[PDB]
Amino acid sequence: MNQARIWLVVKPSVGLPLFLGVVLLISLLVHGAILTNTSWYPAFFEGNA
Amino acid sequence: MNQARIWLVVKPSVGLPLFLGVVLLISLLVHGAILTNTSWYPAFFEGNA
Amino acid sequence: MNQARIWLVVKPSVGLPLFLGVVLLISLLVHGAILTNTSWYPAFFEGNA
Amino acid sequence: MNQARIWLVVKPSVGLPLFLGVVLLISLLVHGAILTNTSWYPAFFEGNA
Amino acid sequence: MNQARIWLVVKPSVGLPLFLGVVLLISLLVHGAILTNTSWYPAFFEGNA
Amino acid sequence: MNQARIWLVVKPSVGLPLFLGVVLLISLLVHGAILTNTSWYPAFFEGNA
Amino acid sequence: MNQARIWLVVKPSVGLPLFLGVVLLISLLVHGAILTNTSWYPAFFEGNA
Amino acid sequence: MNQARIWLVVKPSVGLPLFLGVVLLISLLVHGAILTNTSWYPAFFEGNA
Amino acid sequence: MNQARIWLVVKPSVGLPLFLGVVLLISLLVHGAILTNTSWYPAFFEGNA
Amino acid sequence: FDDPNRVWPSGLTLPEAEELHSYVLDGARIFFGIAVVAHVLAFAYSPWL
Amino acid sequence: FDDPNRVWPSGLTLPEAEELHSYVLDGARIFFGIAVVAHVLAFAYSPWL
Amino acid sequence: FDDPNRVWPSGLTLPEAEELHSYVLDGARIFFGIAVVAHVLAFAYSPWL
Amino acid sequence: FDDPNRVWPSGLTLPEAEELHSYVLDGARIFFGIAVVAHVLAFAYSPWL
Amino acid sequence: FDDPNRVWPSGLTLPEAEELHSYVLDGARIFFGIAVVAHVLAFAYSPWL
Amino acid sequence: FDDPNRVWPSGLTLPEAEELHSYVLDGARIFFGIAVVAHVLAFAYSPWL
Amino acid sequence: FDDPNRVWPSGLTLPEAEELHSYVLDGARIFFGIAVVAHVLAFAYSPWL
Amino acid sequence: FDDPNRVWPSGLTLPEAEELHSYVLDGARIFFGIAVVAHVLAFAYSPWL
Amino acid sequence: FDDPNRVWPSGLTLPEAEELHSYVLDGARIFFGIAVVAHVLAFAYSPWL
Amino acid sequence: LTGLSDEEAKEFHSIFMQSFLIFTAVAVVAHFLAWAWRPWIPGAEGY
Amino acid sequence: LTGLSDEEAKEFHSIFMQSFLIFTAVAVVAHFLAWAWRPWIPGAEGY
Amino acid sequence: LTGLSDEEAKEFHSIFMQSFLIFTAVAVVAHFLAWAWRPWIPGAEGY
Amino acid sequence: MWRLWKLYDPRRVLIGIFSWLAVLALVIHFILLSTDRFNWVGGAAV
Amino acid sequence: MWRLWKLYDPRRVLIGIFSWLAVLALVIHFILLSTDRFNWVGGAAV
Amino acid sequence: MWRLWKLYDPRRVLIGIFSWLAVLALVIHFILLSTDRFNWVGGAAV
Amino acid sequence: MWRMWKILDYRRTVVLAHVGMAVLALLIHFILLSTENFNWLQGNPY
Amino acid sequence: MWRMWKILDYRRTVVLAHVGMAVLALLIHFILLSTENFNWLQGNPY
Amino acid sequence: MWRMWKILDYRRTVVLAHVGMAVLALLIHFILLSTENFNWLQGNPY
Amino acid sequence: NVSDEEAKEFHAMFSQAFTVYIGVAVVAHILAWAWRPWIPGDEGF
Amino acid sequence: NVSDEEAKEFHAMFSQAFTVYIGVAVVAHILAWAWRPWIPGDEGF
Ligand SMILES: CCCCCC/C=C\CCCCCCCCCC(=O)O[C@H](COC(=O)CCCCCCCCCCCCCCC)COP(=O)(O)OC[C@@H](O)CO
Ligand SMILES: CCCCCC/C=C\CCCCCCCCCC(=O)O[C@H](COC(=O)CCCCCCCCCCCCCCC)COP(=O)(O)OC[C@@H](O)CO
Ligand SMILES: CCCCCC/C=C\CCCCCCCCCC(=O)O[C@H](COC(=O)CCCCCCCCCCCCCCC)COP(=O)(O)OC[C@@H](O)CO
Ligand SMILES: CCCCCC/C=C\CCCCCCCCCC(=O)O[C@H](COC(=O)CCCCCCCCCCCCCCC)COP(=O)(O)OC[C@@H](O)CO
Ligand SMILES: CCCCCC/C=C\CCCCCCCCCC(=O)O[C@H](COC(=O)CCCCCCCCCCCCCCC)COP(=O)(O)OC[C@@H](O)CO
Ligand SMILES: CCCCCC/C=C\CCCCCCCCCC(=O)O[C@H](COC(=O)CCCCCCCCCCCCCCC)COP(=O)(O)OC[C@@H](O)CO
Ligand SMILES: CCCCCC/C=C\CCCCCCCCCC(=O)O[C@H](COC(=O)CCCCCCCCCCCCCCC)COP(=O)(O)OC[C@@H](O)CO
Ligand SMILES: COC(C)(C)C/C=C/C(C)=C/C=C/C(C)=C/C=C/C(C)=C/C=C/C=C(C)/C=C/C=C(C)/C=C/C=C(C)/C=C/CC(C)(C)OC
Ligand SMILES: COC(C)(C)C/C=C/C(C)=C/C=C/C(C)=C/C=C/C(C)=C/C=C/C=C(C)/C=C/C=C(C)/C=C/C=C(C)/C=C/CC(C)(C)OC
Ligand SMILES: COC(C)(C)C/C=C/C(C)=C/C=C/C(C)=C/C=C/C(C)=C/C=C/C=C(C)/C=C/C=C(C)/C=C/C=C(C)/C=C/CC(C)(C)OC
Ligand SMILES: COC(C)(C)C/C=C/C(C)=C/C=C/C(C)=C/C=C/C(C)=C/C=C/C=C(C)/C=C/C=C(C)/C=C/C=C(C)/C=C/CC(C)(C)OC
């Protein structure tokens, strides 16, 4: 809430797509980390068969 | 629906292809994640033989 | 059919090679995904010997 | 044969090297896909010993 | 605290996103290093099942 | 022999280094493909001991 | 101490971030090399359980 | 010896660093290819212990 | 000692950081090659435990 | 920030951004609509759930 | 946004965008048409389904 | 540094930066809000915790 | 869109695009023709089919 | 090098660099503060130490 | 398209392109010539064929 | 090469390069100083040496 | 194409290209000369051949 | 090519190139000097040789 | 607001409601027919 | 609308419908022949 | 259309057709010879 | 309630509703096909 | 129904129809070839 | 049929035909070489 | 009900209808083909 | 309570309400479907 | 039926016909070659 | 952008196509029902 | 862009080529049928 002027020195054309893409990348890495380190997440994919 | 002004600071020439390509990348990663963590999705490929 | 004005904001010099290359990339990934998750596609390569 | 004006919007300086290199990339991928999924293609390399 | 003039020679538009992204990259690498080299962090993901 | 005017639309400063570098990449890939799919090429490296 | 004029030919906007980032990369590689080639560094992560 | 005019169309600022770096890359690959496909090169590293 | 005029055609802003970084990359690769192909270098990391 | 005629940093006026975003949202809804039917097919004809 | 003469940010007029997109759709239909016949051949002559 | 009219290096005035950051914060809160409900669903319906 | 003299965004006139694409198609036919003979050799002298 | 009005190569004056770095340091302290509480939570509730 | 004086988009005249392509072809033939002798050595002194 | 006022290719005068390099050396010494204490802690409390 | 004064697309005159290529060839010969002695040492002191 | 005042494509005069290369060679000798002592330490205290 | 008069909005609404009621009436009949086939509200004993 | 007159559209439509009916008539005869070979509507007992 | 007159197109066509007939005549003779060696149309019993 | 059509574009509302209805009907029909009781083409026996 | 040809380009409609027909016929013929009953070249016996 | 040569470039048609013929002849000859009956250099015995 | 075409574009609606119903018809035919009671090509007993 | 629409925009609130309740209704229906006592399609004994 | 060439370009249609029928003829010949009853090079009994 | 009469013409083409399409669809479903009814009883088909 | 007479010439070449192509196709199929009919009976070929 205090860093509104981060956008005065960082171009939003590069700051915003980088921020949103990086947030999504974190989500994929967390999803992937749990998928490869649990049995239940692959089992949720597997289902009844 | 409220973020129509994202396209006033992010150039659509880079925002749009990044968005569409990243959405497709998510789809491929989800497809690949299920493919490598189920038996039925490979079995669907395998078929009767 | 409704998105002809995608090419008014996305440069075709970058939109078209990205589109065609990405479509080919999808095809390669699908070909590879079936190749690595079936026995018959490798066997089609293998043939009689 | 109908797409001659693809080169009016896509710069040949980028369209042509991309096209030729990507065609070669497909050839390498197909060659590699068969090499890693057959016994006879590695055996062709192996020869009599 | 003494390096405020790093931003007189390094452009903030490139220094700041690189700094923040790299800090996040360190966090992911440390998270990943512990995840792949312990049993309890995967077990925390696994839970009761 | 017929394509001398490929260099009227593709800049030689990028067409030539790409061509020579890609040719070398093919040579490395072929060398590597035989190395990893034969016994005699590693044996030639191995020698008498 | 004798190379202060390295910054008269190399732009600090690229030389400084490259230098600091590369120093961090070395630290990560050393940390990773020891982590993957010892038993005690993974055991330090593992702790009592 | 006959290609002195390669440098009239290829910029030396990009041709020379690419050429030297690529030559080093070939050297690393050849060193690495022998290292991973022999017992004596790893044994040279290993020494008496 | 004879190539001082390499810097008349190659820009030092790119030639120097490339040279120094590449030298470091060689050093890391040699360190990594010995680490992964010896027992004593990992044992030096391992120490008494 | 409601100037119809102002050209923002992205190269668009506000009405142009609103029109572009509407295609983005309509595209997302169609994508989401197809995805929902795809998911129920995945529910109905795959071991999932 | 129906000005035939305006040159949009991508460098195209609206009629030029419409004409380009028609080739994109016609290209897609031909690609999809060949894909459908490819799929039925895959259905008829592969273990799939 | 409270000039409403000054155009900073990023291409934005201070009021434009404040308005942009508000969407960034509002976007984060909505993302965090959906994440929290996602986490409690993960707590309630997955073996985690 | 049949102006012989107009220079399109790619930097080519329509007659120049037609001439360039003719080499592209003639190149493809020669490539495809060589591929067909290569394929029948693969049929005749490899376990394929 | 204490000129308030000079615009340095990065595009900032010295007062602007001091102000930017203060947000950098304040951001780091908050990050370090959250990290320290995170570490003690890791100490208190994980097998580490 | 037979103007000796016109400077095409690549920055070359037609005679300059013809002269450049001749070195490309002469280089290719020398490369192919050395390859053919290399291949027959591979035939004569390797288990291939 | 001792001109205080000349602006070199990097965009710096010689006094600016001297001042910048001093922070680089001071940064290195602090980094090295912290590294040495880190190493002795590694010596004192890890199986190394 | 024997104009000593013309400045070609690479930014070099023909005499400048000839002088540059001479250092390239002299560099290659020295590299080849050192390589040959390296190879004979490899022949004399390694199991190769 | 012995003009002290000419500014070559890299942005340097010949005396500037000579001075820059002297730091490069002096840098290499120090690097080589440290490397030689590092090697003899490796010879003396590692199983190598 | 969009460029629609009070009269056009009133005319659209009357048709929209009429079309909705017809769509619902068909759905209601379809549901009565579906109930005659197999009721979807199980009793205490199940199906 | 495309640059086609009422008469040109009427002339195309008459030929389009005639050509469609000929394509269908050949298909109908083909389907009658295919039925004579092997009917594709199984009975209650199957094929 | 390409820059060819009715007379040049007629002159090319006569040579093209003559050259085609000669190419086919050689092929026909080649196929007659190949048939004398081994017919490629199997009978009901095979080869 | 007729004032709703001055606020919202009647064309875009119709598309949204028809899109929602098409998705919802497909969801319900395929949910039923997956059930043992309401799978009509599967010959479901109660 | 002739007014359809003022709305739509007759050339594009014919190509779309012919493309659809060519794809459909290939689909039906190869579906039949996969069947045990309608595979004519495979010597199918009922 | 001579009007075909005003529509199409006679040089490019000859190249396409000769290229098609060269490819076809290689295809047929090597298909025959793969057969047990028509492989002439292989000493095929009926 | 002719007023519908003053709201929705008849140009796009027709094309979307033909493509949408093409997909719907193929889906239903294929779904029936996947069943045992309505696969007219397989011809199982009813 | 009409004063709410001088604070919150009635344009966005209505759209957000219909989407938000759409998600909420689907969630509750699916949660009930996942239970054994309230899955009306499965029809387990209560 | 000569009016067809006022709609479809006879220039492209002829080329597309020769390429399309070339592919179709190869497909049919190869499909027959893959069968046991119509592979004239293999010559199995009928 | 569309006049009242032009909307009548669009609807006239639509009504003709819809009537034929549904009329064939209804006849198809009567034939399909005569072949194999798709609404099972309590014991199945 | 195409005159009535030019379309007649195009159709004249089309009709000549179509007639020869189909005529050879029909003869080829008569010959192929005489060799091995491709419509199996109830018991096969
Ligand atoms: C991985 C799974 C999830 C990933 C999802 C996607 C995440 C990241 C993708 C990349 C993020 C968006 C990058 C957009 C960069 C271009 C934006 C832009 O437009 O930046 C422009 C220049 O950027 C420039 O040079 C510099 C442009 C290069 C920036 C590249 C940044 C590095 C790549 C991203 C790394 C992300 C982390 C690693 C993930 C693998 C400046 O903007 P304007 O004011 O218009 O200036 C106009 C001038 O440029 C005209 O000459
Ligand atoms: C992986 C499986 C699915 C992937 C599918 C494809 C997904 C992503 C591919 C890349 C997405 C499209 C990127 C297009 C970027 C260029 C568009 C562009 O045109 O951006 C231009 C500049 O971009 C610039 O510098 C910057 C240009 C560089 C942008 C690079 C962004 C990072 C790469 C993408 C990362 C994606 C996530 C990681 C995936 C592994 C600005 O536009 P204009 O207003 O015309 O300005 C004109 C001036 O530039 C002229 O000097
Ligand atoms: C993988 C197997 C199949 C892959 C096949 C190939 C697929 C993708 C390859 C890349 C696709 C083509 C990218 C071409 C981009 C450059 C085209 C271009 O020409 O874009 C130009 C700028 O592009 C710019 O900055 C931006 C230039 C950088 C764009 C980089 C995009 C990211 C890389 C592609 C990622 C693809 C998905 C991931 C695949 C691994 C703008 O065009 P003009 O109007 O002429 O402007 C003139 C000015 O530029 C002059 O200064
Ligand atoms: C991995 C998991 C976490 C990762 C999270 C993300 C981390 C890193 C992603 C990249 C970080 C942001 C990079 C943004 C760079 C572009 C910003 C920019 O805008 O830089 C501009 C130029 O950048 C330029 O050339 C150069 C632009 C290219 C810079 C590329 C830097 C290398 C790539 C990043 C490497 C990160 C470490 C490796 C991680 C795998 C300069 O700014 P301005 O003053 O407006 O100048 C205007 C002119 O450019 C107009 O022509
Ligand atoms: C792998 C093992 C063997 C590999 C060996 C090496 C092979 C390939 C390495 C790269 C090949 C050389 C690339 C040189 C490109 C720069 C040359 C150049 O100079 O291109 C210039 C611009 O290129 C531009 O932007 C855009 C330039 C983009 C070039 C990058 C292309 C993609 C990377 C190469 C991919 C190779 C294949 C994949 C290999 C893994 C144009 O030239 P000029 O007329 O001077 O214009 C002057 C203007 O630019 C001034 O603003
Ligand atoms: C890996 C784990 C730890 C990693 C931590 C991070 C390490 C490295 C990340 C990258 C390091 C920072 C790179 C910043 C480069 C951009 C800075 C910049 O701004 O450089 C600018 C140009 O850079 C240019 O072309 C060149 C831009 C591209 C440079 C990219 C160099 C290659 C990428 C870095 C490789 C590092 C080693 C490999 C690690 C994977 C020039 O500066 P200015 O004087 O403003 O000129 C203004 C003009 O550009 C305007 O047109
Ligand atoms: C791997 C483990 C150790 C690695 C350590 C680090 C090693 C390498 C990192 C990269 C090396 C430094 C690259 C810096 C390049 C930018 C420097 C620069 O500043 O180059 C500038 C342009 O560079 C340009 O386009 C081109 C800029 C792009 C150059 C990218 C080179 C390829 C990437 C490096 C590959 C290294 C080897 C492979 C490593 C895995 C030119 O300089 P100036 O005279 O100011 O011109 C001003 C104009 O540009 C303004 O418009
Ligand atoms: C005036 O302006 C004019 C009109 C000129 C410009 C107009 C331009 C036009 C016509 C533009 C057209 C725009 C279009 C076509 C827009 C289309 C937009 C679409 C298709 C949007 C679709 C969006 C879909 C989204 C955002 C889906 C997101 C999904 C996410 C984020 C899922 C994440 C999943 C995760 C993280 C799961 C991970 C789990 C595992 C481990 C499986 O994953 C690897
Ligand atoms: C006026 O203009 C002037 C004349 C001045 C400019 C003219 C310039 C000139 C002379 C230009 C020359 C142009 C040339 C030489 C063009 C050459 C074109 C060529 C060689 C085209 C060849 C094309 C080949 C293609 C497109 C092949 C495509 C193959 C595809 C798409 C295969 C895909 C396969 C897949 C996806 C299979 C995957 C399976 C597995 C798993 C095995 O793959 C990994
Ligand atoms: C006038 O100028 C003004 C004042 C305007 C500009 C001033 C700007 C300012 C304030 C600049 C600030 C600059 C700073 C903060 C500079 C900081 C410099 C630092 C922190 C330097 C630190 C250097 C540390 C170094 C170089 C360490 C190098 C380590 C090396 C090379 C280790 C290599 C190790 C290897 C190769 C080992 C490999 C073994 C294994 C296998 C483990 O590796 C994977
Ligand atoms: C007027 O101009 C002035 C004078 C101002 C500019 C002058 C500038 C100066 C002073 C320039 C200096 C230039 C220099 C120093 C040039 C140096 C050139 C050198 C060192 C050339 C060396 C060349 C060596 C070569 C090209 C070696 C090539 C080796 C190849 C291609 C090997 C390929 C091997 C393969 C493909 C094997 C693969 C097998 C396995 C599987 C093992 O590989 C992975």
| Shortest Cα distance, chain I CAs vs residue P11, angstroms | 11
**d(C-alpha J40, C-alpha J18), whole Å:** 33
Which residues line the pocket of ligand 9, CB cutoff 6 A? C 27-28, 31-32, 35; D 23, 26, 29-30, 33; F 3, 5-6, 8-9; M 16, 19-20, 23-24, 27-28, 31; O 1
- C-alpha E16/C-alpha E3 separation (Å) is 14
Do C22 and B17 meet the contact criterion of CB atoms below 8 Å apart?
no
Contacts of F33 in chain D (CB under 8 A): 31-32, 35, 45
A24 Cβ below 6 A of ligand 1: yes
Give the Cβ contact number of residue AB6 at 10 Å: 16
Report which of AA37, P23, R36 is spatially closest to residue E5, judged by C-alpha positions.
P23
The rounded distance, in Å, linking the Cα atoms of P21 and G12 is 10
CB F21 within 8 Å of CB H22:
yes
Asked if residues Y38 and Y32 have their Cβ atoms less than 8 Å apart, the reply is yes
Nearest C-alpha neighbor of A3 from the set A21, A17, A15, A18? A15
| Integer Cα distance of O8 and U7 in angstroms | 38
Pocket of ligand 3 (CB under 6 A): C 11, 13-14, 17-18, 21-22, 24-25, 28; D 11, 14, 18, 22; K 11; M 9
Ligand found nearest the CA of I1: 11
- Tell me the two tokens of residue I17: 């950081």
Q: Please report which ligand is nearest the Cα atom of B33.
A: 8
Torsion of CA A12, A15, A18, A19, to 10 degrees: -100
Distance from the G2 Cα atom to the nearest Cα atom in chain I, whole angstroms: 16
Burial class (CB in 10 A: 0-12, 13-18, 19+), E41: buried
Distance (Å, whole) CA AC39 – CA W37: 12
Report the half-sphere exposure of T41 (CA within 13 A, side-chain side): 9
CA T9 from centroid of its chain's CA atoms: 21
Of J14, J46, J47, the CB nearest to B8: J14
Euclidean distance between the first and the last CA atom of chain L, given in angstroms as a whole number? 48
Give the gap in angstroms from C-alpha U9 to the nearest C-alpha of chain X: 5
Instruction: Name the one residue in this structure whose structure tokens are 């057709």.
Output: U17
Question: Would you call A31 helix, strand, or coil by DSSP?
Answer: helix
Outline where chain D has alpha helix (H): 12-35, 40-46
Please give the Cα distance from I2 to I15 (Å, whole number): 17
Residues of X in Cβ contact (< 8 Å) with U2: 5-10
Amino acid at R11: G
d(CA L14, CA L4) in angstroms, rounded, equals: 6
Q: How many CB pairs under 8 A join F and M?
A: 7
- A17 close to E24: Cβ distance less than 8 angstroms: no
d(CA C22, CA B21) in angstroms, rounded, equals 8
**Ligand with an atom nearest the CA of residue P24:** 10
> For chain R, which chains pass the contact test of at least 3 CB pairs under 8 Å?
G, H, I, P, Q
| DSSP letter (8 states) at residue T5 | -
Burial class (CB in 10 A: 0-12, 13-18, 19+), H7: buried
Residue of E22, E29, E37 lying closest to G45 (CB–CB)? E37
Residue U5 corresponds to which tokens in the numbers above? 């007159």
DSSP assignment of chain K equals ---SS---TTS--HHHHHHHHHHHHHHHHHHHHHHHHHHHHHHHHSS--
Resolution (A): 2.2
Q: How was this structure determined?
A: cryo-EM
For residue N17, which of V37, Q24, E2, Z34 has the smallest C-alpha distance? E2
Distance CA AC16, CA AC37 (A): 29
Q: Do the Cβ atoms of O23 and H6 come within 8 Å?
A: yes
* Contact between N3 and N11 (Cβ < 8 Å): no
Going by the DSSP 8-state scheme, the letter that residue R40 receives in this structure is H
Encode A1-39: b = buried (16+ Cβ within 10 Å), e = exposed: eeebbbbbbbbbbbbbbbbbeeeeeeeeeeeebbbbbbe
A29 in contact with ligand 1, CB cutoff 6 A: no
Pocket test for ligand 4, best of A22, A25, A27 (most atoms within 8 A of CB): A22
Q: How far is Q44 from chain H (nearest CA, A)?
A: 14
Instruction: Report d(CA R20, CA M15) in Å as an integer.
Output: 51
The answer to whether AC45 and AA46 have CB atoms below 8 angstroms apart is: yes
Give the C-alpha separation, O8 to X9, whole Å: 27
Q: State the DSSP code for C47.
A: T
**Alpha-carbon distance B33 to R16, whole Å?**
56
> What is the token pair recorded at O10?
């690549």
User: Which residues, including other chains, have CB under 8 Å from residue V40's CB and lie 6 or more apart?
Assistant: V32, V33, AB38, AB39, AB40
Instruction: Please provide residue S43's backbone torsions phi and psi, each rounded to the nearest 5 degrees.
Output: -85, -175
Of the candidates N20, P8, G23, the one whose C-alpha atom is nearest the C-alpha of residue E10 is N20
* Mutational pocket test of ligand 8: of B30, B35, B36, B41, the residue with most ligand atoms within 8 Å of the beta carbon: B30
Inspect the structure and tell me whether chains Y and Q have 3 or more CB pairs less than 8 Å apart.
no
Q: Outline where chain G has alpha helix (H).
A: 12-36, 40-46
Query: Are residues F6 and D14 in contact, defined by beta-carbon separation less than 8 angstroms?
Result: no
V46: Cβ contacts below 8 Å, ≥ 6 apart:
S38, S47, V37, AB42
Give the residue whose CA is nearest to atom 35 of ligand 1: A18
F3 CB contacts (<8 Å, ≥6 apart)? M23, M27, O21
Distance, CA N10 to ligand 10 centroid (Å)? 21
CB E24 within 8 A of CB A19: no
**Rounded CA gap, C18 and D18, in Å?**
10
d(CA B18, CA P23): 39
Dihedral class, residue K7 (left if φ above 0, else alpha if ψ from -120 to 50, else beta): beta
Closest CA to D15 of M29, M17, B17: M17
Task: Specify the 3-state DSSP secondary structure of R38.
Answer: helix
Dist. CA V30 → ligand 9 center (Å): 44
Burial U18-47 (b: 16+ CB within 10 A, else e): eeeeeeeeeeeeeeeeeeeeeebebeeeeb
Asked whether V38 and S40 are in contact (CB, 8 A), the reply is: yes
Ligand 6 center to P16 CA (angstroms): 21
Q: Residue F34 corresponds to which tokens in the numbers above?
A: 């035989």
Q: Answer whether A31 contacts ligand 1 (Cβ < 6 A).
A: no
Instruction: Report chain C residues whose CB lies below 8 A from the CB of J24.
Output: none
